[PDB]
From a paper:
Numerous human NAbs against SARS-CoV-2 target the receptor-binding domain (RBD) of the S, primarily blocking the interactions between the S and its receptor ACE2.2–6 Recent studies have also reported antibodies that potently neutralize SARS-CoV-2 by binding to the N-terminal domain (NTD) of the S,7 raising the possibility of formulation of an antibody cocktail capable of targeting both the RBD and NTD. Amongst the antibodies identified during the screening, two humanized NAbs, H014 and HB27, and one fully human NAb, P17, target the RBD and confer effective protection against SARS-CoV-2 in animal models.
Theoretically, HB27 might act as a fourth partner to constitute the multi-component cocktail under the condition of the partial saturation of the RBD with H014 or P17. Distinct from the three-antibody cocktail, two RBD domains with simultaneous bindings of H014 and P17 adopt open conformation, while the other one RBD (cyan, mol A) interacting with HB27 alone inserts into the groove constructed by the NTD and RBD from its neighboring S (violet, mol B), forcing the contacted RBD and NTD to rotate outside by ~5°. Accompanied with the transition of the RBD, sterically tight packing on the third side of the “triangle” is largely released, resulting in ~10° and 30° shifts of the NTD (cyan) from itself and the RBD (yellow) from the mol C, respectively. Although HB27 has potential to target both the open and closed RBDs, structural superimpositions demonstrate that full saturation of HB27 could possibly occur only when at least two RBDs of S trimer are in the open conformation due to the steric clashes raised by the other copies of itself in the presence of over two closed RBDs.
Numbering used by the authors:
A (entry chain I): 2 to 121
B (entry chain K): 0 to 107
C (entry chain C): 14 to 251, 256 to 296
D (entry chain V): 1 to 120
E (entry chain B): 346 to 592
F (entry chain S): 2 to 110
G (entry chain D): 2 to 106
Write the structure that this text describes.
């Protein structure tokens, strides 16, 4: 039913910041989950998947920074660590789901700002 | 390579009661894997059509999904002030998924 | 969990003689005003009964001693204690009293006694730990201290509390409770008798008749058993354990032919141990 | 007899933040004994805070500071979180975990958390 | 609450009473088919081991859960063997399961890589791959997500409306239990000389309530002659004295 | 805070001198008093509880008294390591809370 | 699930004559209605109490609210009337009501 996100903030470039997003209402477990990016004034750009029902991780090669994705299935939560930062990734992120002709499960988090800058 | 999307027009300033056809052509043919999202600034995206053939539950009949294969489009009818919003198309054919650049329907 | 008290010295076990003891109805069939002879596990009359103090207090402040050791079940087990205050909530029966062996656990912490037959990994010293709930002015005792975990539980049961103390007696009664535990052909029977006793410790001359509350098919032989003590934490005074003093008597049933005298009521009264005397 | 486990430990919070204080125990279980809190400012004295009430069974809150700080309890993990909010210039102080007896008719703070310093 | 069909909960009806007399009286089940023998005859017979499967499906979907029946709900949600002696109980649950705006809590496995075996559930939600290319548990072209959200509405037709279904499977095993229901047992006759069979023991005697306070747990009585002293009914805890017919 | 005790006091070593705390009937009058000790940057230690009870590990040299609204903390057998601040406290029903005095930092001369 | 719709009928023909399915307190949206002829295997007329099956002249409609259902035979003549039975399908024993022996002037 509901998705909550870890806190965004201002991080210096080159660093790492683990992204937590917990589910509620129905589990993460039976589904997949995604991350997308929205820069201000920019379109929604897909980032990376998670696939718990086997195990597989796909990343966008457009932003191929080894942003690693794993999960806390028993907390219905999902972790993507912001690795190899660069300033144009300063944006808001969303926890996502795609209706793949079968489901209607597209549920979106509230959105938190990751900021990549040396100036706090 | 990647699958390119082509969302046209990328904006359309509109009026009350229109019937806007927001087109989202795909460079690589997609059999039925397309979705439409309605989003507003500071708001989470809301799915309007799933598979571009069946309306999402909780979505008004005026929003409609049309087109197949290479060309896909969104049909909006009985446009209302609440209805005006930024609309993004969506592939789910391959990996990577890309979304359209958005179409802001806005009051003339 | 698994708190262990060894203190300093276990001490020699006390010894006592019971003139009449371990009298129970061997046969379910009701008999009135008749004399019958049956051979079954029984406590022999006029025989020494070992006395063990679960908690021993020396003639000085504090100095509480954990003197209760694991006791072999043997052919049969008999438990006798005045127990005006109930600290013996339950008795643990296990072949090894360890995990991978079906262990019988009784808890009187709940209003109705709960009997469990699950494998329990008992700690070297197993006793219930009581913590103040802080809600509803109530104290809760945990069997987690007694055993680390429960697994492969063949069976479980719920029964009326085996130990009941009305209280207000203020002596002259002692709320004495007698329990008989025996396992035959994989069947375990628990017998409860409440007898008012004028004597503070020595067992009374009068015969006591024990009736089995329920018959349970445990299906596993028991060769060892130990008492359980409910102990509450003690705070600063100008973790606390072994609060109060507990003394219990254990008598081992030996198969014997026992003459049974049946009253018009049908309750067993007089009992005779056949090999005890030529008469 | 019983020594309280370390509470917050080392916490740094620049202005524009708020901090929970989680005080655990050892040798007891959490809800057999009541916790308490006292403000101690370096070079200054004691200001009592938080606390549980033996009477009425409520968890007290110092009236002066009431509503700014809250407390929750996890009985099994012995974690009692003291969340102070809305940082102020003189708000920063060393906070000592405190505890009174469950039997009631008691006031003495008993064992101590050893002291942790919040930052504003 | 009842578990979803894709992962149905299984509860074994062993060491538990078997009573369908209340079920006949309630008459609240949309479909209550019975197999092998007449419904009264199975109700009376004691069952050594029974198996209960709990799941929620549409009224049309219930047909897929039937012996030797091939359907979307029969090929990947769950399967019943062609020879089934068990009775299947289905009742309309539209009043409780369905909610305004639709009910999406329950899920059904529309497809799966292979046909599911009878008395089996799929604990894996990995995407099925119809295409040769491997989806590998993530959405892909030529494959679809196997689970599809259920849609339950009060306005929808009775077949569309949700049904809670429990499947009972009857099996014979050595392992016994303490009590039983009707017991396929002729009614006891008392105050007349009669031949009575109890727990494999046949005796002929007049039957009367026992004046002696015989204990309830024992089913039989012991005498010095070794003739049975008293008997207890297998349907109810009543103690009956045994007196041989006058000679 | 709401109670009365001086910032500091001094005395020669090995001597006998106490410290008192002046409350009211609303605080000390109906309530029991406690006393606490802290060394610089350390853990404040319970000294005496209830005006008559000494915690485990306290030298017996310490006593206490409550006269009306006045409560004295008996301090005897001064040591070189006894220099620290002592805090009075008692239960308050006024604000229905726990109260303390400002503290008195002893000095062993 | 007992039904007690309509003992019988006695009315001039050609009129809008109603037969009133008296359902039990338990309600069932689904139902059926069948036409019986003397010593003739009857046939279901009203399917689901609202839908028409193929082959029925529209003389008799089925309109009902909740548990109650009425099979208003509109403009019935002396050619059609026989017995008309109600059927209930929700409750396990799919009971049949007393039924209406339609008769007319
Ligand atoms: C159950 O266990 C007890 C205790 O081990 C067995 O009693 C032993 O029996 C043997 C053979 O008669 C004796 O040599 C031992 O001295 C007995 N020990 C005790 C403590 O009495 C008992 O035989 C076992 N019963 C079964 C059926 O295995």
């Amino acid at each position: 039913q509901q998705l909550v996100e870890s806190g965004g903030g201002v991080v210096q470039p080159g660093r790492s910041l683990r992204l937590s997003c917990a589910a509620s209402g129905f589990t993460f477990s039976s589904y997949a989950m995604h991350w997308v990016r929205q820069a201000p004034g920019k379109g929604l750009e897909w980032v990376a998947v998670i696939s718990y029902d086997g195990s597989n991780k796909y990343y966008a090669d457009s932003v191929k920074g080894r942003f690693t994705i794993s999960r806390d299935n028993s907390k219905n939560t999902l972790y993507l660590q912001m690795n190899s930062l660069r300033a144009e990734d300063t944006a808001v992120y969303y926890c996502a789901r795609h209706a793949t002709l079968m489901n209607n499960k597209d549920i979106w988090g509230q959105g938190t700002l990751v900021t990549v800058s040396s100036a706090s | 390579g990647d699958i390119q999307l082509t969302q046209s027009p990328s904006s359309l300033s509109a009026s009350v009661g229109d019937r806007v056809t927001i087109t989202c052509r795909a460079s690589q043919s997609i059999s039925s894997y397309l979705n439409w999202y309605q989003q507003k600034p500071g708001k989470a995206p809301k799915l309007l059509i799933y598979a571009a053939s069946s309306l999402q539950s909780g979505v008004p009949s005026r929003f409609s999904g049309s087109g197949s294969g290479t060309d896909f489009t969104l049909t909006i009818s009985s446009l209302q002030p609440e209805d005006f919003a930024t609309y993004y198309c969506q592939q789910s054919y391959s990996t990577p998924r890309t979304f359209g650049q958005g179409t802001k329907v806005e009051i003339k | 969990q698994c708190v262990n008290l060894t203190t300093r010295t276990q001490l020699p076990p006390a010894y006592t003689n019971s003139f009449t003891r371990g009298v129970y109805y061997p046969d379910k069939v009701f008999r009135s005003s008749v004399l019958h002879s049956t051979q079954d596990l029984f406590l022999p009359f006029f025989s020494n009964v070992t006395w063990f103090h679960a908690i021993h207090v020396s003639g000085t402040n504090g100095t509480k001693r954990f003197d209760n050791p694991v006791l072999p079940f043997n052919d049969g087990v008999y438990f006798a204690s005045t127990e005006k205050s109930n600290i013996i909530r339950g008795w643990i029966f296990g072949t090894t009293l360890d995990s991978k062996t079906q262990s019988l656990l009784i808890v009187n912490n709940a209003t109705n006694v709960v009997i469990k037959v699950c494998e329990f990994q008992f700690c070297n010293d197993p006793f219930l730990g009581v913590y103040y709930h802080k809600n509803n002015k109530s104290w809760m005792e945990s069997e987690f201290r007694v055993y680390s975990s429960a697994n492969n539980c063949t069976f479980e049961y719920v029964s009326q509390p085996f130990l009941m103390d009305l209280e207000g007696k203020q002596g002259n009664f002692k709320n004495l409770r007698e329990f008989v535990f025996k396992n035959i052909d994989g069947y375990f029977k628990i017998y409860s008798k409440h007898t008012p006793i004028n004597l503070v410790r020595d067992l009374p001359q009068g015969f006591s008749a024990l009736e089995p509350l329920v018959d349970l098919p445990i299906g596993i032989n028991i060769t060892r058993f130990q008492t359980l003590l409910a102990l509450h934490r003690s705070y600063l005074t100008p973790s606390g354990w072994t609060a109060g003093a507990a003394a219990y008597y254990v008598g081992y049933l030996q198969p014997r032919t026992f003459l049974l005298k049946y009253n018009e009521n049908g309750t067993i009264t007089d009992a005779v141990d056949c090999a005890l005397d030529p008469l | 007899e019983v020594q309280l486990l370390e509470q917050s430990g080392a916490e740094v919070k620049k202005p524009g933040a708020s901090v929970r204080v989680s005080c655990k125990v050892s040798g007891y279980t959490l809800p057999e004994v009541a916790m308490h809190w006292v403000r101690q400012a370096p070079g200054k004295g004691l200001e009592w805070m938080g606390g549980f009430d033996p009477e009425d069974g409520e968890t007290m809150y110092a009236q002066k500071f009431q509503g700014r700080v809250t407390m929750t309890e996890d009985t099994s993990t012995d974690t009692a979180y003291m969340e102070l909010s809305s940082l102020r210039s003189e708000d920063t102080a060393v906070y000592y975990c405190a505890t009174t007896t469950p039997f009631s008719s008691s006031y003495w703070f008993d064992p101590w958390g050893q002291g942790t310093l919040v930052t504003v | 609450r009842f578990a979803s069909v894709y992962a149905w909960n299984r509860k074994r009806i062993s060491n538990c009473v078997a009573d369908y007399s209340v079920l006949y009286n309630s008459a609240s089940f949309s479909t209550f088919k019975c197999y092998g023998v007449s419904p009264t005859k199975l109700n009376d017979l004691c069952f050594t081991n029974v198996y209960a499967d709990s799941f929620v499906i549409r009224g049309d979907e219930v047909r897929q859960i039937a012996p030797g029946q091939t359907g979307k709900i029969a090929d990947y949600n769950y399967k019943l063997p062609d020879d089934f002696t068990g009775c299947v109980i289905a009742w309309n649950s539209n009043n409780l399961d369905s909610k305004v705006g639709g009910n999406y809590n329950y899920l059904y496995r529309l497809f799966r890589k292979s046909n599911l075996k009878p008395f089996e559930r799929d604990i894996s939600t990995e995407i099925y791959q119809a295409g040769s290319t491997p989806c590998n548990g993530v959405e892909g072209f030529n494959c679809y997500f196997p689970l599809q959200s259920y849609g339950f509405q009060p306005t929808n037709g009775v077949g569309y409306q949700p049904y809670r279904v429990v499947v009972l499977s009857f099996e014979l095993l050595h392992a016994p239990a303490t009590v039983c229901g009707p017991k396929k047992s002729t009614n006891l006759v008392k105050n007349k000389c009669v031949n009575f069979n109890f727990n494999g023991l046949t005796g002929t005697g007049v039957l009367t309530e026992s004046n002696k306070k015989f204990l309830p747990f024992q089913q039989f009585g012991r005498d010095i002659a070794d003739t049975t002293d008293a008997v207890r009914d297998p349907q109810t805890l009543e103690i009956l004295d045994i007196t041989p017919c006058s000679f | 805070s709401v109670l009365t005790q001086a910032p500091s006091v001094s005395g020669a070593p090995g001597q006998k001198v106490t410290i008192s705390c002046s409350g009211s009937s609303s605080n000390i009058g109906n309530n029991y008093v406690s006393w606490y000790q802290q060394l610089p940057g350390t853990a404040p230690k319970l000294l005496i509880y209830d005006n008559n009870k000494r915690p485990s590990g306290i030298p017996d040299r310490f006593s206490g008294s409550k006269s009306g609204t006045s409560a004295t903390l008996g301090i005897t057998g001064l040591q070189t390591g006894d220099e620290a601040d002592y805090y009075c406290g008692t239960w308050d029903s006024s604000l229905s809370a726990v109260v303390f005095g400002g503290g008195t930092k002893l000095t062993v001369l | 699930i007992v039904l007690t719709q309509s003992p019988f009928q006695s009315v001039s023909p050609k009129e809008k004559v109603t037969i009133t399915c008296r359902a039990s307190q338990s309600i069932s949206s689904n139902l059926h209605w069948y036409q019986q002829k003397p010593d003739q295997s009857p046939k279901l007329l009203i399917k689901y109490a609202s839908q028409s099956i193929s082959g029925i002249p529209s003389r008799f409609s089925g309109s009902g609210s909740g548990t109650d259902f009425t099979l208003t035979i509109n403009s019935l003549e002396a050619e059609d009337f026989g017995i008309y039975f109600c059927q209930q399908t929700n409750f396990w024993p799919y009971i049949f009501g007393q039924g209406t022996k339609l008769e007319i002037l």
